[PDB]
Design a protein around this nucleic acid. Structure first.
Ligand SMILES: [Mg+2]
Ligand SMILES: [Mg+2]
Ligand SMILES: [Mg+2]
Ligand SMILES: [Mg+2]
Ligand SMILES: [Mg+2]
Ligand SMILES: [Mg+2]
Ligand SMILES: [Mg+2]
Ligand SMILES: [Mg+2]
Ligand SMILES: [Mg+2]
Ligand SMILES: [Mg+2]
Ligand SMILES: [Mg+2]
Ligand SMILES: [Mg+2]
Ligand SMILES: [Mg+2]
Ligand SMILES: [Mg+2]
Ligand SMILES: [Mg+2]
Ligand SMILES: [Mg+2]
Ligand SMILES: [Mg+2]
Ligand SMILES: [Mg+2]
Ligand SMILES: [Mg+2]
Ligand SMILES: [Mg+2]
Ligand SMILES: [Mg+2]
Ligand SMILES: [Mg+2]
Ligand SMILES: [Mg+2]
Ligand SMILES: [Mg+2]
Ligand SMILES: [Mg+2]
Ligand SMILES: [Mg+2]
Ligand SMILES: [Mg+2]
Ligand SMILES: [Mg+2]
Ligand SMILES: [Mg+2]
Ligand SMILES: [Mg+2]
Ligand SMILES: [Mg+2]
Ligand SMILES: [Mg+2]
Ligand SMILES: [Mg+2]
Ligand SMILES: [Mg+2]
Ligand SMILES: [Mg+2]
Ligand SMILES: [Mg+2]
Ligand SMILES: [Mg+2]
Ligand SMILES: [Mg+2]
Ligand SMILES: [Mg+2]
Ligand SMILES: [Mg+2]
Ligand SMILES: [Mg+2]
Ligand SMILES: [Mg+2]
Ligand SMILES: [Mg+2]
Ligand SMILES: [Mg+2]
Ligand SMILES: [Mg+2]
Ligand SMILES: [Mg+2]
Ligand SMILES: [Mg+2]
Ligand SMILES: [Mg+2]
Lengths: 119, 82
RNA sequence: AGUAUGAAAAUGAUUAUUUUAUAAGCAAUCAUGAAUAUAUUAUAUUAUAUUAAUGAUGUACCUUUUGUAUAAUGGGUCAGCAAGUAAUUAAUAUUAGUAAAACAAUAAGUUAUAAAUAAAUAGAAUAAUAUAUAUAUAUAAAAAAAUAUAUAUUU
RNA sequence: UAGCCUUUAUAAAUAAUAAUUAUUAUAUAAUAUAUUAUAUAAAGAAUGGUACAGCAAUUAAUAUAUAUUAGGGAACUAGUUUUUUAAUAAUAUUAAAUCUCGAAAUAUUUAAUUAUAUAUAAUAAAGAGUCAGAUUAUGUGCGAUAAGGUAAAUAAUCUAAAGGGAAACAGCCCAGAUUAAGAUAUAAAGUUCCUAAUAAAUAAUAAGUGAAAUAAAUAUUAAAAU
RNA sequence: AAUAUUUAAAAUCAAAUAUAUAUAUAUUUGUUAAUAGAUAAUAUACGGAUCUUAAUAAUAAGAAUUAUUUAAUUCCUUGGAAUAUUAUAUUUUAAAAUAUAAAUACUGAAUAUCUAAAUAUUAUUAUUAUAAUAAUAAUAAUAUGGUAAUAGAACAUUUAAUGAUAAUAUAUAUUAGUUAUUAAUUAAUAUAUGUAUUAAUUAAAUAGAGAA
RNA sequence: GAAAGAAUUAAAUUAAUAUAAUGGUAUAACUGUGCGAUAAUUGUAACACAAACGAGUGAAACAAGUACGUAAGUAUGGCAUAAUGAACAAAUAACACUGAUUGUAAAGGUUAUUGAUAACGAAUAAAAGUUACGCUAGGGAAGGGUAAUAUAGCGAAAGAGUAGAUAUUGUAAGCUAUGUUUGCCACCUUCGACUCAACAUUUCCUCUUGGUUGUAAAAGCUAAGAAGGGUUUGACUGUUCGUCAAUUAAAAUGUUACGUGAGUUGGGUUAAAUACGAUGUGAAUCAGUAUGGUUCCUAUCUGCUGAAGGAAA
């Protein structure tokens, strides 16, 4: 290994904060998507925008992917997530079966919340 | 109701399927704002690119000209010709 | 190796301005003091020009390579010279001329005007769009595959 | 030659790209134990056999004061018991590139709908170049779970991409330079000084451990929980 | 206290979210540290300086390491409210009371916006003179890194065809201006020439050299 | 209640399939049996799959004829996926198409068939070696990485040690370091001697110290600190190395382009000459042996050794 890819094995505090913020943003996006759908469905039934926003009973999304994203068991929120799953991917060939998320290529775009139950 | 979707991240490190989805959605460059009438189809497409994009719901959409007008900064002066 | 002329450059010496004897690397660019020069509107607290205070950024150029600051190629510098051109043809395209004809006008020819078929004495609505017709295979004649031909004016 | 690139055009043109709907079940309401609507749940039309999971059948491995089949010993007067040797059965437990009876996600992929049209496909007439590739990540073959190794699979970047970060850096993290301007949002990465930018909270460390390239079995000393 | 394990949130408990809801069900989260082991040849090598805080005593420092977090702290549902803080002003006796503010952490690209300029296309205009056009100028949008390659548009140079003009001119050179500038033009200065095969349009090329 | 039939359910594709392996097959594609021996037929084949082209694959339908079946229908070889070869040039037939003045002919064409190019998209009907006498065009189409090996260490301790695993020793298996050996990779196209050495410490000697029923003493053995100083001369060989001789306090191990050829040498390795043994029909060749035998360099910069001038004191 003569070429030096000087990437540290762990993240800095600032990196971790940015990661957390990114995770929070994707959860927010999902929430907005569900909310807009609900609003649209209220309008279809025949309420005003404000009335729809007020509504006690929020409509859950019927499409599959959205419904999965809503579930925390499948796609957890940043507040829900463990410290470890925020900053460590599962890597079967690593010692500890764990690897920094920053070592994943395009980790800033690519999402990866859920690790295996005991790894 | 309308999703105001914004292409927050670039499409440089992004695979070709996700690029194609972004193109279909209508977003060109980074930070290129697009309003979309809400429906299941557009919602699912947005979910598919959830990490590149910032979405927020709105009462009304805006045409490109309106958006431009909103953007324009205040010229702090009033011309008086003589 | 003509004759005039020659502030063309490389190159040498000298003078002037400016910087330089505690500072380290493509010697430039950008920031920015100072010094000097020029300026018949510097009215100035001015403008331009020249100059390695000081600060920041800055790994020659080409070639060949997956990849070159490379200790890979090539160049001492400047001046001059040094590389997709012609002929005879064929196919496309664009325009222009003429146009069911064109070129040529002495005739002759080339292309077009009919599609086929290895080739032969075969060759396009019997009452209309293919469901008709022509050709090649086949045949008594159709059907069948293929391509072509037809819905005031021929293309 | 095809693949990928370019130019000029053609339409009784959206055929392209992306997603949704499509299914199953439950509850409620309305009609005729069925149908429709609404809401919710379910990795949700069709195709599949990798991961995972599993030991079924196949191929392999282990154990039985268990049973049967024979054999070798052994005690009394050929019969009999025990300590057994293998095989077979029974029961329990295990694994495999060429085992999958269970089984994902990603994937392949169809209709209509919506969204992309200052956008795509297809076709027609013409021009190319290229066929030494590299690294990173993931899943493998070879190698020794060695190589800046080698061989291909998928994605990205470099190739041909300047800019910010990673001390310096082809391939990593961001992000694509038409020309400026420099007020505002920022990305990745940073905020004691060098060096543009910082203040806090709660724990732990005392080894300069560490502070952007994490060195192992094991040992000692603590600390919690039982 | 002693012996022996484990270093765990599966179970268990605690806390939080979602469905009927003072409870039940389902989901999500929470379970050690230090040292030794330790190791080669130009020179210490976190990039370097340097970084573990300390009362008296500061209008003042107290990780710049590791782990979990925040953008002053605490409740309620990004937002408001309360709480103290900090700074400031006022009033009263260096303190107290009242009130105003700050709470949007910041840096950061050739990213995006704004601000202007250019070209190209699409869609609207305006002005001036296939007028369903051309030129120029507006507005909105999209696009403009590029090797191999493809396509489009220009300029310099030399010759041929046509061709005014003139030493107050032309050409070449130097210096300083000008025009979004390989080019040309203005002025000054110099040297030549009684003068552009000149401007412009065509036709062509021994038509552009830091790379053999 | 009994007999017979029709059968259904469960299981099975582990047998069998002309043939490998895989998929399929009991609704059988497997097996038996009647007829038959035909469809192991003739012209057009769309449309798909696959696909650079050349080819390859499945195939509806139309037309002619055939075999089986009461009929429905089925058959254009085999349950499927291998069982193969272009043109050119010859050859054989059929076709009635051309017939170089006309007629015949020849010769060519169409249709069907024939043999191989296995380096198997086949260059020709037909082609092996050698060069250290070689030549031209190009390409690189010890250092670096690795650490299997090697060297060193650590953990655990079977076992030796008169008794006791751990004074000293330490099987096989375990965890590391090193980049000193032999390899592997292919980014990257000279051994020894002399001379002068610089550096490391994993210490051979000298200094300090722990352990040593195996430290009585003296010699040792083993371990910790320690790089200040020191660490060989000869015979043999080109040798480093090694064997020995004589010494020494000791004759340590490396790194430095296995330091040092613009500093020396040139014995080894190395081309031209020649011979020998072996190999080859031979030219010639060799992880062979032997004699002979070719590079040079005035120092520009860095650096170092000395010596001046200038200077800001
Ligand atoms: Mg000085
Ligand atoms: Mg110097
Ligand atoms: Mg050099
Ligand atoms: Mg060079
Ligand atoms: Mg040279
Ligand atoms: Mg016929
Ligand atoms: Mg090609
Ligand atoms: Mg469609
Ligand atoms: Mg497999
Ligand atoms: Mg299965
Ligand atoms: Mg290749
Ligand atoms: Mg490689
Ligand atoms: Mg290239
Ligand atoms: Mg770059
Ligand atoms: Mg690119
Ligand atoms: Mg761009
Ligand atoms: Mg340290
Ligand atoms: Mg480090
Ligand atoms: Mg739990
Ligand atoms: Mg060091
Ligand atoms: Mg640092
Ligand atoms: Mg920009
Ligand atoms: Mg371009
Ligand atoms: Mg020329
Ligand atoms: Mg020249
Ligand atoms: Mg040039
Ligand atoms: Mg079988
Ligand atoms: Mg296909
Ligand atoms: Mg084909
Ligand atoms: Mg059969
Ligand atoms: Mg058979
Ligand atoms: Mg031949
Ligand atoms: Mg004749
Ligand atoms: Mg061949
Ligand atoms: Mg071949
Ligand atoms: Mg060949
Ligand atoms: Mg041959
Ligand atoms: Mg010889
Ligand atoms: Mg013993
Ligand atoms: Mg051993
Ligand atoms: Mg090495
Ligand atoms: Mg030592
Ligand atoms: Mg003694
Ligand atoms: Mg001393
Ligand atoms: Mg040497
Ligand atoms: Mg030398
Ligand atoms: Mg040298
Ligand atoms: Mg002699």
């Amino acid at each position: 290994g003569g070429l030096l890819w000087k990437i540290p094995w762990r993240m800095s505090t600032h990196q971790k904060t940015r990661q957390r913020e990114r995770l929070r943003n994707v959860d927010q996006v999902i929430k907005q998507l569900t909310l807009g759908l609900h609003v649209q469905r209220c309008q279809d039934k025949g309420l005003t925008y404000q009335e729809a926003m007020e509504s006690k009973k929020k409509y859950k999304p019927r499409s599959k992917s959205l419904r999965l994203l809503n579930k925390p068991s499948v796609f957890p929120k940043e507040n829900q997530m463990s410290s470890k799953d925020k900053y460590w991917t599962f890597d079967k060939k690593a010692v500890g079966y764990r690897k920094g998320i920053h070592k994943v290529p395009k980790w800033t775009k690519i999402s990866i919340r859920k690790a295996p139950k005991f790894f | 109701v309308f999703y105001k979707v914004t292409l927050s991240r670039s499409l440089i490190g992004v695979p070709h399927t996700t690029k194609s989805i972004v193109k279909s959605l209508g977003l060109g460059k980074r930070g290129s704002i697009v309003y979309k009438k809400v429906n299941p189809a557009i919602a699912g497409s947005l979910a598919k690119v959830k990490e590149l994009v910032k979405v927020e719901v709105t009462e009304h959409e805006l045409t490109p000209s309106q958006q431009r007008e909103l953007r324009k900064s205040n010229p702090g002066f009033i011309v008086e010709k003589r």
